[PDB]
Scaffold this active site. Structure first.
Site, mmCIF file in Angstrom:
data_model
loop_
_atom_site.group_PDB
_atom_site.id
_atom_site.type_symbol
_atom_site.label_atom_id
_atom_site.label_comp_id
_atom_site.label_asym_id
_atom_site.label_seq_id
_atom_site.Cartn_x
_atom_site.Cartn_y
_atom_site.Cartn_z
ATOM 1 N N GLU A 72 56.190 -29.604 -91.592
ATOM 2 C CA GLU A 72 56.963 -30.812 -91.265
ATOM 3 C C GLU A 72 57.330 -31.637 -92.511
ATOM 4 O O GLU A 72 58.253 -32.448 -92.470
ATOM 5 C CB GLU A 72 56.162 -31.685 -90.285
ATOM 6 C CG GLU A 72 56.967 -32.750 -89.516
ATOM 7 C CD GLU A 72 57.206 -32.400 -88.039
ATOM 8 O OE1 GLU A 72 56.241 -31.980 -87.342
ATOM 9 O OE2 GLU A 72 58.364 -32.566 -87.572
ATOM 10 N N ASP A 107 66.261 -39.555 -91.036
ATOM 11 C CA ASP A 107 66.396 -38.119 -90.692
ATOM 12 C C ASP A 107 67.790 -37.801 -90.156
ATOM 13 O O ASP A 107 68.661 -38.669 -90.156
ATOM 14 C CB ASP A 107 65.267 -37.624 -89.750
ATOM 15 C CG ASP A 107 65.254 -38.314 -88.381
ATOM 16 O OD1 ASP A 107 66.237 -38.985 -88.001
ATOM 17 O OD2 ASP A 107 64.234 -38.174 -87.672
#
Lengths: 433, 16, 433, 16
Positions: A210, A219
């Site tokens: 991750e 993001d």
């Protein structure tokens, strides 16, 4: 103050004890015997159990004497009377302390996995003799001295007779200390450090998969996130994201955090995730069957796709539970998860197959579950006795004065619970099941 | 019996 | 059996003890105080000594009471009587066990240097409280209970008065065990494992520089050699070289040996080399002044060029001895040794300069010498007392019966040796010299 | 004095 008188009990001495001593002997003499010829001729954790099973064997072959002593008389002279008490002292000390070494072995294999192959070897091949046997052997000295046959009530008895209460209380205290308290502390220390390492391993795993972000990050969906995939806010505001991060860490960051902090925050998100799994009809059973490393595998998947998401792999899950690893890996190998994020998937899958960190050194699996059961079982066996003899020594010191019905009841508990303890011999063989 | 001893004129054991 | 009577000694109580208690107090109260304000405000091994020095401080400020008790009377009520015995119990337990943690800290830093930065932090920042203080604090319970003021001979006294000999022998045994024997075993274990690692480090060093050869090898001069620069024979015969290797390892090799064997053989050659150094007017003093890592540096050079050879660097040697590292490195940087084998030389020189394994992770020196002196000094202080109280408890048990002149002489030794022990406070500050 | 105690009618200490 004349001493409290207790009656001898026929049914106890004549039926109960011989029964138990026999059952233990049979299931013991064969169980350890098979362990010694199989594991002895024709893995570090087994090596220790070789020793352990030799320590228990040497004890079980002493039980027939114990039994005929219980029912009838001591027919066997003074050398064998000493040998019986000696062996006992060796066993109960060696037996527990070998477990401690197993626990240290795990501490080394897991906390210092990168290179502790050496010190683990010397612990198993050399130190075990300098730190377990020899000291066990030297502790039998008193048995050689004080174990003697005495004529009492038209029969012979084989007791340890020390000079006085001063002696007795001290050695009874040494017995507790060396017998549980010390090796206990060693074991618990090992346990504590491992679980700390186990959860740091998870942290390093999601670090690769991750990714670790020490600065606030927008993001691909526009959400503000920090650390290991920890979403701060969905809101458009940078200032909102800034305002949450502070509330999460507890200080005034300017949108950056440290390595220590990222991890503390990650641990909280592991906690919550694990609580979710334990409260999920589908995932609970699967997670419970799995080991330390494979739990980490499942936790990874949850983190990515949420627990409902992971619960959807009906088939693969049922294989995991059933320990059919390769079939679990081939199913998962063809999923929407695999196409969308294929490298992460493959590592997580390899983890499920191998039970090791090969996707993060090769083919190196080290298991805990069988060891933890052995030790807990071992202490469950002895714990009642030791509570027993504690209270007995609290009486000797006069910390607790309660007349003869109490004192005598405590003596009775100790006899039962000593006899029941001897089932620790068999735990070792049985657990090979 | 593992914890016997002399108390004055008496022989005792601690039981066990 | 009426108890043995001993006389109280005026000069001892009136002159000797107050003198000692004062000297210790002065040199103590300042010494630890400076350690606390310097090291406290404005390195893991120092962190522990911060604790240690707080443990000793808390003790020294108790000495004035001890002194006025010795000469005159106990003027200070019952709360302060308890506090005096409490503090003492905390100090002598915490004080030794903090040393053990220092010893574990070294074990981690050295045996598991590659990554033990984590567990070393938690040992220093967290565990120290759970494993040293709290347990020290809980062990003072008896002091709170049994430490009380008693009127005796027209004055007040502050003694621990337990119910009976049963109590006394047990706690006196707990005292020995927790006070030396246990923490001793921890320390010695740490020591043993480190020296084993220290010599394996040497082995890995010459592995890089001189090279590991697991098959018999004909070097550039035609000599047959195996392992780390171990010459087997100068003779032309392959069969002679084959015949020596067997005699060296003790089995029938066919001219190949294993990794374990190469090392056993290397250790023997280290031994011999080190014996040579200790028996060499030039090298002995230099080797003795150096640390674990720099010793390894010197040993490397010997291996290459023989001890006479190394003894020739008159100038560089005198700098090493005097701890002027960079000057030692610049001299050696221009030698025939440096031109003939320049990469080996440079690493060996960097080692001499840094005292670390940077030529084999960067700038990471971890020293032992100051710690080893602290601990040995600490036990030298207490050892006489503990031999003292052992013999005293052997008397209590009646293992040794020898009348009153003996018993009384042992009591006298304990008083002297207890008082002299209190010099352990200052060892810590002084050693900063 | 750290190791005092009661022996019958007597008070003792172990010395130290």
């Amino acid at each position: 103050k004349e001493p409290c008188f207790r009656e001898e009990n026929a049914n106890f001495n004549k039926i109960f004890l011989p029964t138990i001593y026999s059952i233990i002997f049979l299931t013991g003499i064969v169980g350890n015997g098979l362990v010694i010829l199989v594991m002895g001729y024709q893995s570090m954790t087994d090596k220790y159990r070789l020793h352990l099973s030799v320590a228990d064997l040497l004890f079980v072959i002493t039980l027939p004497f114990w039994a005929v002593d219980a029912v009838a008389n001591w027919y066997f002279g003074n050398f064998l009377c000493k040998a019986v008490h000696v062996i006992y002292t060796v066993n109960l000390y060696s037996s527990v302390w070998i477990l401690a070494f197993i626990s240290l072995d795990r501490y080394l294999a897991i906390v210092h996995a990168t290179n502790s192959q050496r010190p683990r070897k010397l612990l198993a091949e050399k130190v075990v003799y300098v730190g377990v046997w020899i000291p066990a052997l030297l502790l039998t000295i008193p048995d050689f001295i004080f174990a003697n046959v005495s004529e009492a009530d038209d029969r012979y008895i084989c007791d340890r007779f020390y000079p006085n209460d001063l002696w007795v209380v001290v050695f009874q205290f040494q017995h507790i200390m060396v017998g549980l308290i010390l090796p206990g502390i060693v074991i618990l220390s090992c346990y504590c450090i491992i679980i700390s390492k186990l959860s740091h391993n998870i942290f390093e795993m999601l670090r690769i998969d991750e990714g670790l972000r020490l600065k606030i990050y927008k993001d691909t969906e526009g959400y503000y996130t920090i650390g290991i995939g920890h979403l701060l806010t969905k809101s458009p505001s940078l200032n909102a994201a800034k305002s949450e991060l502070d509330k999460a860490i507890g200080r005034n960051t300017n949108g950056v955090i440290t390595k220590d902090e990222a991890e503390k925050l990650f641990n909280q998100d592991v906690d919550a995730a694990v609580r979710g799994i334990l409260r999920n009809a589908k995932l609970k059973p699967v997670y419970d069957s799995l080991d330390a490393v494979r739990r980490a595998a499942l936790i990874n998947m949850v983190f990515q796709m949420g627990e409902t998401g992971v619960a959807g792999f009906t088939n693969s899950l049922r294989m995991l539970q059933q320990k059919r690893w390769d079939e679990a890996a081939v199913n998962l190998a063809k999923s929407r998860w695999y196409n969308q994020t294929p490298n992460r998937a493959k590592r997580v899958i390899t983890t499920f197959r191998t039970g090791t960190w090969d996707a993060y050194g090769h083919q190196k699996r080290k298991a805990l579950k069988p060891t933890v059961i052995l030790i807990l079982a071992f202490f469950a066996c002895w714990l009642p006795y030791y509570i027993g003899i504690s209270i007995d020594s609290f009486i000797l010191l006069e910390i607790i004065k309660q007349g003869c019905e109490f004192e005598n009841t405590v003596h009775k508990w100790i006899s039962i619970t000593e006899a029941l303890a001897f089932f620790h011999c068999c735990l070792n063989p049985i657990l090979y099941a | 019996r593992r914890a016997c001893y002399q108390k004055x004129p008496y022989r005792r054991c601690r039981g066990x």
